[PDB]
Design a protein around this motif. Structure first.
Motif, mmCIF file in Angstrom:
data_model
loop_
_atom_site.group_PDB
_atom_site.id
_atom_site.type_symbol
_atom_site.label_atom_id
_atom_site.label_comp_id
_atom_site.label_asym_id
_atom_site.label_seq_id
_atom_site.Cartn_x
_atom_site.Cartn_y
_atom_site.Cartn_z
ATOM 1 N N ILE A 1 -18.401 -54.405 -15.474
ATOM 2 C CA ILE A 1 -19.307 -55.072 -14.548
ATOM 3 C C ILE A 1 -19.810 -54.052 -13.529
ATOM 4 C CG2 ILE A 1 -19.581 -56.938 -12.899
ATOM 5 C CD1 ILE A 1 -17.155 -58.298 -14.125
ATOM 6 N N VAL A 2 -21.122 -54.002 -13.340
ATOM 7 C CA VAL A 2 -21.700 -53.069 -12.393
ATOM 8 C C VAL A 2 -22.587 -53.760 -11.365
ATOM 9 C CG1 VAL A 2 -23.104 -51.006 -12.087
ATOM 10 C CG2 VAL A 2 -21.622 -51.217 -14.097
ATOM 11 N N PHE A 3 -22.236 -53.577 -10.096
ATOM 12 C CA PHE A 3 -22.997 -54.147 -8.994
ATOM 13 C C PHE A 3 -23.812 -53.030 -8.359
ATOM 14 C CE2 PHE A 3 -19.388 -57.273 -8.869
ATOM 15 C CZ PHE A 3 -20.143 -58.417 -9.059
ATOM 16 N N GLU A 4 -24.966 -53.384 -7.799
ATOM 17 C CA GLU A 4 -25.838 -52.419 -7.137
ATOM 18 C C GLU A 4 -26.520 -53.104 -5.951
ATOM 19 O OE1 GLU A 4 -29.596 -52.175 -7.039
ATOM 20 O OE2 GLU A 4 -29.053 -50.620 -5.586
ATOM 21 N N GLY A 5 -26.701 -52.363 -4.864
ATOM 22 C CA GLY A 5 -27.344 -52.923 -3.684
ATOM 23 C C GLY A 5 -27.474 -51.894 -2.570
ATOM 24 N N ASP A 6 -28.315 -52.182 -1.579
ATOM 25 C CA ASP A 6 -28.513 -51.263 -0.458
ATOM 26 C C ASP A 6 -27.501 -51.491 0.659
ATOM 27 O OD1 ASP A 6 -30.915 -49.866 -1.352
ATOM 28 O OD2 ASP A 6 -31.941 -51.791 -1.040
ATOM 29 N N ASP A 7 -26.830 -52.634 0.609
ATOM 30 C CA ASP A 7 -25.859 -53.017 1.621
ATOM 31 C C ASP A 7 -24.430 -52.779 1.141
ATOM 32 O OD1 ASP A 7 -24.129 -54.673 3.315
ATOM 33 O OD2 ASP A 7 -26.003 -55.525 4.079
ATOM 34 N N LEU A 8 -23.799 -51.708 1.622
ATOM 35 C CA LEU A 8 -22.430 -51.379 1.215
ATOM 36 C C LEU A 8 -21.416 -52.466 1.552
ATOM 37 C CD1 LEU A 8 -22.152 -47.567 2.045
ATOM 38 C CD2 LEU A 8 -22.771 -48.693 -0.096
ATOM 39 N N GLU A 9 -21.539 -53.056 2.737
ATOM 40 C CA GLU A 9 -20.628 -54.121 3.142
ATOM 41 C C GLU A 9 -20.703 -55.291 2.168
ATOM 42 O OE1 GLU A 9 -20.612 -55.408 7.247
ATOM 43 O OE2 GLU A 9 -21.199 -53.404 7.925
ATOM 44 N N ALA A 10 -21.917 -55.615 1.726
ATOM 45 C CA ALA A 10 -22.107 -56.710 0.782
ATOM 46 C C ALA A 10 -21.478 -56.350 -0.565
ATOM 47 C CB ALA A 10 -23.587 -57.000 0.603
ATOM 48 N N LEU A 11 -21.620 -55.093 -0.973
ATOM 49 C CA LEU A 11 -21.048 -54.657 -2.245
ATOM 50 C C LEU A 11 -19.533 -54.714 -2.192
ATOM 51 C CD1 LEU A 11 -23.181 -51.498 -3.165
ATOM 52 C CD2 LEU A 11 -22.987 -53.575 -4.554
ATOM 53 N N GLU A 12 -18.965 -54.325 -1.056
ATOM 54 C CA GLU A 12 -17.518 -54.335 -0.929
ATOM 55 C C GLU A 12 -16.929 -55.745 -0.818
ATOM 56 O OE1 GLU A 12 -17.201 -51.270 2.282
ATOM 57 O OE2 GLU A 12 -16.574 -49.955 0.636
ATOM 58 N N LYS A 13 -17.706 -56.707 -0.331
ATOM 59 C CA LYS A 13 -17.204 -58.084 -0.262
ATOM 60 C C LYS A 13 -17.150 -58.587 -1.708
ATOM 61 C CE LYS A 13 -19.033 -59.701 4.215
ATOM 62 N NZ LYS A 13 -19.887 -60.753 4.849
ATOM 63 N N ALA A 14 -18.180 -58.237 -2.470
ATOM 64 C CA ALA A 14 -18.280 -58.619 -3.874
ATOM 65 C C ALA A 14 -17.112 -58.016 -4.657
ATOM 66 C CB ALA A 14 -19.599 -58.135 -4.455
ATOM 67 N N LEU A 15 -16.804 -56.753 -4.379
ATOM 68 C CA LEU A 15 -15.690 -56.075 -5.045
ATOM 69 C C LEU A 15 -14.391 -56.853 -4.826
ATOM 70 C CD1 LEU A 15 -14.165 -53.610 -6.336
ATOM 71 C CD2 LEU A 15 -14.101 -52.661 -4.018
ATOM 72 N N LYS A 16 -14.086 -57.148 -3.567
ATOM 73 C CA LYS A 16 -12.867 -57.878 -3.241
ATOM 74 C C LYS A 16 -12.741 -59.230 -3.932
ATOM 75 C CE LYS A 16 -12.638 -55.519 1.170
ATOM 76 N NZ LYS A 16 -11.336 -54.816 0.998
ATOM 77 N N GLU A 17 -13.837 -59.972 -3.994
ATOM 78 C CA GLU A 17 -13.820 -61.284 -4.629
ATOM 79 C C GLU A 17 -13.654 -61.180 -6.148
ATOM 80 O OE1 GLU A 17 -13.404 -64.040 -3.357
ATOM 81 O OE2 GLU A 17 -13.695 -65.273 -5.151
ATOM 82 N N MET A 18 -14.327 -60.197 -6.744
ATOM 83 C CA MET A 18 -14.287 -59.955 -8.190
ATOM 84 C C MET A 18 -12.855 -59.520 -8.576
ATOM 85 S SD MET A 18 -16.567 -60.406 -10.754
ATOM 86 C CE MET A 18 -14.981 -60.752 -11.684
ATOM 87 N N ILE A 19 -12.230 -58.722 -7.713
ATOM 88 C CA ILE A 19 -10.861 -58.256 -7.935
ATOM 89 C C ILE A 19 -9.894 -59.431 -7.862
ATOM 90 C CG2 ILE A 19 -8.901 -57.069 -6.918
ATOM 91 C CD1 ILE A 19 -10.770 -54.921 -5.929
ATOM 92 N N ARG A 20 -10.103 -60.275 -6.859
ATOM 93 C CA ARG A 20 -9.256 -61.433 -6.646
ATOM 94 C C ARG A 20 -9.330 -62.333 -7.876
ATOM 95 N NH1 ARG A 20 -9.354 -66.720 -3.016
ATOM 96 N NH2 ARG A 20 -9.977 -67.318 -5.143
ATOM 97 N N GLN A 21 -10.551 -62.609 -8.323
ATOM 98 C CA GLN A 21 -10.765 -63.453 -9.490
ATOM 99 C C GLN A 21 -10.119 -62.862 -10.746
ATOM 100 O OE1 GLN A 21 -12.077 -66.492 -9.517
ATOM 101 N NE2 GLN A 21 -12.423 -66.353 -7.300
ATOM 102 N N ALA A 22 -10.344 -61.572 -10.984
ATOM 103 C CA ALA A 22 -9.784 -60.905 -12.163
ATOM 104 C C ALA A 22 -8.258 -60.947 -12.174
ATOM 105 C CB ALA A 22 -10.267 -59.457 -12.233
ATOM 106 N N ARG A 23 -7.644 -60.653 -11.034
ATOM 107 C CA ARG A 23 -6.195 -60.657 -10.941
ATOM 108 C C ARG A 23 -5.598 -62.059 -11.036
ATOM 109 N NH1 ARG A 23 -6.063 -56.069 -6.138
ATOM 110 N NH2 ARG A 23 -6.203 -54.257 -7.535
ATOM 111 N N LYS A 24 -6.380 -63.075 -10.685
ATOM 112 C CA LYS A 24 -5.895 -64.447 -10.764
ATOM 113 C C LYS A 24 -5.603 -64.773 -12.231
ATOM 114 C CE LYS A 24 -8.864 -67.615 -10.699
ATOM 115 N NZ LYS A 24 -10.031 -68.388 -10.208
ATOM 116 N N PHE A 25 -6.386 -64.177 -13.126
ATOM 117 C CA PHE A 25 -6.228 -64.374 -14.563
ATOM 118 C C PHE A 25 -5.299 -63.305 -15.140
ATOM 119 C CE2 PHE A 25 -10.604 -66.222 -13.988
ATOM 120 C CZ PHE A 25 -10.300 -67.518 -14.401
ATOM 121 N N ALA A 26 -4.623 -62.574 -14.260
ATOM 122 C CA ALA A 26 -3.703 -61.512 -14.665
ATOM 123 C C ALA A 26 -4.425 -60.369 -15.377
ATOM 124 C CB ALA A 26 -2.593 -62.076 -15.561
ATOM 125 N N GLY A 27 -5.688 -60.162 -15.027
ATOM 126 C CA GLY A 27 -6.425 -59.069 -15.632
ATOM 127 C C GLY A 27 -6.113 -57.826 -14.820
#
Length: 170
Positions: free
Chosen positions: A6-32
């Protein structure tokens, strides 16, 4: 098993990092298991250890985050041990980025690589999977030709087996 990129792109680093944290949380919830790299304005996330049904759910989550954080996103599901290459083009002339997109697609198809991409007003992120070393070399040659031909910056991230390779010019 299967792997998901999965690849995210954007001009707002803070927005990208919020997305990272949520995507990580979701992935780990499924034990990925997650692997991720933030470089420039691109965010590459690799997820392993999850069954097919989950990968589809994570695909949905990726789409949800695009609308939740106003960022561009693309993703591919592929085989373990398959080679992946992420190429980032940057420039002020959008028409130049579109030419690059068309050319890279032509090349990926020639070598039977599966391609996805995201294009904003000034940044083009291309993801090509199912590409062995010999093919990645040719694709890089094409990117360098486009770079010289249109004066646009190009960055690369390659993942093969147990290797992650990053490259910028100079």
């Amino acid at each position: 098993m299967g792997v998901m990129v999965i690849v995210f792109e954007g001009d707002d680093l803070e927005a990208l990092e919020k997305a990272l944290k949520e995507m990580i949380r979701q992935a780990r919830k499924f034990a990925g298991t997650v692997t991720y790299t933030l470089s420039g304005n691109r965010l590459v996330i690799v997820i392993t250890g999850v069954p097919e049904q989950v990968r589809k759910e994570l695909a949905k989550e990726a789409e949800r985050l695009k609308a939740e954080f106003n960022i561009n996103v693309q993703y591919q599901i592929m085989g373990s041990g398959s080679g992946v290459m992420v190429i980032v083009f940057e420039g002020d002339d959008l028409e130049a980025l579109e030419k690059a997109l068309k050319e890279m697609i032509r090349q990926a198809r020639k070598f039977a690589g599966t391609v996805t991409y995201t294009l904003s007003g000034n940044r083009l992120v291309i993801v090509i999977t199912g590409v062995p070393e010999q093919v990645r070399k040719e694709l890089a040659k094409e990117a360098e030709r486009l770079k010289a031909e249109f004066n646009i910056n190009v960055q690369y991230q390659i993942m093969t087996g147990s290797l992650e390779h990053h490259h910028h010019h100079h």
